[PDB]
Design a protein around this ligand. Structure first.
Ligand code: A1AQM
Ligand code: FMN
Ligand code: ORO
Length: 354
């Protein structure tokens, strides 16, 4: 009824109007500004959405994926939007501009975006001071089941990938509930992740974040088997499955389908779910998975949960549906959980594998 009306209006009228008036990067920039200022209305989270994972309570399992709030400017407005957790970044050590504009492209016919931002970042030091300003506010949020993740990048020109990520661990690890490293042979991955975990383990017990590895959906079977093996061997805390795809699934209609970059949204959905499914099996259900890629409904959310995800993220659906999508996904997920006989989200995790 009321929520649905709001959802209708945003999906059918407001967002298409606003996206038609703006270039896509301007739209992103304006969203971050509006969100930072809390210019949003406000769905009471039931107990059945609560998840305990990664050393933390999550009030609900629907997170904002990396890339929306690259520089940690809008964290409080994102909780206000109703996300159960927030992931900022990617943040690189040094400030960098990222790629030339235009670098974001809408494929509205496909409910997809292509981006090639190229890790535009304010840098660790700006983001550190920004999180420091609200550090105690975040400690209370985390305690109340609303944790904060930080995705760490590397500078375009850097010689030593591992040292960039290490810098990130040292600077932002003390302010994060979890840290994320994106990965694109096996001995080099082990070397990199060893160094990351060593740095993490050197932070004082109360400032010690979980470390997650975030994979694209474009990896070979050999890459996925090697990642599962290294993740288990090293005691990596979790996996974020997946980033955008450099593939172009047959059937894209948008005029901008041949733009270089990462494809997100609906055409990534089932690629992403199947990657969750394979990573869950290769890790024997022992490594918590955050599912991401084309979530715009409770059904999308539940398919990833049942495939092996403990938590989900979305970004692209926000570009088409606006802020009401968060309440929509949560409400539909709750209803689906009851319809399939699950007492809560926890019971559904990996339910397809059993
Ligand atoms: C991929 C880059 N990218 C694109 C282009 O593909 N769009 N986009 C978003 C834009 C918006 C906008 C724009 C249209 C002004 C407003 N609002 C919003 C709000 F922030 C506060 C109260 C009302 C509204 Cl509608 C959103 O939530 C929102 C979210 C997005 F992800 C975004 O990150
Ligand atoms: C504009 C844009 C910027 C992104 N930036 C980042 C980033 O800096 N780091 C990262 O790990 N993922 C980034 N992502 C990937 C998302 O976090 C997510 O994995 C992907 O978009 C799939 O989810 P979706 O289909 O819900 O958007 C970005 C995605 C988009 C669309
Ligand atoms: O900044 C970007 O280009 C970017 C980073 C990332 O991890 N994923 C993505 O789709 N874009």
């Amino acid at each position: 009824a009321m929520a649905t009306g709001d959802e209708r209006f945003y999906a059918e009228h407001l967002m298409p109007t606003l996206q038609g008036l703006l270039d896509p990067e301007s739209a992103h920039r304006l969203a971050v500004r509006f969100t930072s200022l809390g210019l949003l209305p406000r769905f009471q989270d039931s107990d059945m959405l609560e998840v305990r994972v990664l050393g933390h309570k999550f009030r609900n399992p629907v997170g904002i994926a990396a890339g929306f709030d690259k520089h940690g400017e809008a964290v409080d407005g994102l909780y206000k939007m109703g996300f159960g957790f927030v992931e900022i970044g990617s943040v690189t050590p040094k400030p960098q501009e990222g790629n030339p504009r235009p670098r974001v492209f809408r494929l509205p016919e496909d409910q997809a975006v292509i981006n090639r931002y190229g890790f535009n970042s304010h840098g660790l030091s700006v983001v550190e001071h920004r999180l420091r300003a609200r550090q105690q506010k975040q400690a209370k949020l985390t305690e109340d089941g609303l944790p904060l993740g930080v995705n760490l990048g590397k500078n375009k020109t850097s010689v030593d990938a591992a040292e960039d990520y290490a810098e990130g661990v040292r600077v932002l690890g003390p302010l994060a509930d979890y840290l994320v490293v994106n990965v694109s042979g096996k001995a080099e991955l082990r070397r990199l992740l060893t160094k990351v975990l060593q740095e993490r383990d050197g932070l004082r017990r109360v400032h010690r974040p979980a470390v997650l590895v975030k994979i694209a959906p474009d990896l070979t079977s050999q890459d996925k088997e090697d990642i599962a093996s290294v993740v288990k061997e090293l005691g990596i805390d979790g996996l974020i499955v997946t980033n955008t795809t450099v593939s172009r699934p047959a059937g894209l209609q948008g005029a901008l389908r041949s733009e270089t970059g990462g494809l997100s949204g609906k055409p990534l959905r089932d690629l992403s779910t199947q990657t969750i499914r394979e990573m869950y099996a290769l890790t024997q259900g022992r490594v918590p998975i955050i599912g991401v890629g084309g979530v715009s409904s409770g059904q999308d959310a539940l398919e990833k949960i049942r495939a092996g995800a403990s938590l989900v993220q979305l970004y692209t659906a926000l570009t088409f549906w606006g802020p009401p999508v968060v309440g929509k996904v949560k409400r539909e997920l709750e209803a689906l959980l009851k319809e399939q006989g699950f007492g809560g989200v926890t019971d559904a995790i990996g339910a397809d594998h059993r």
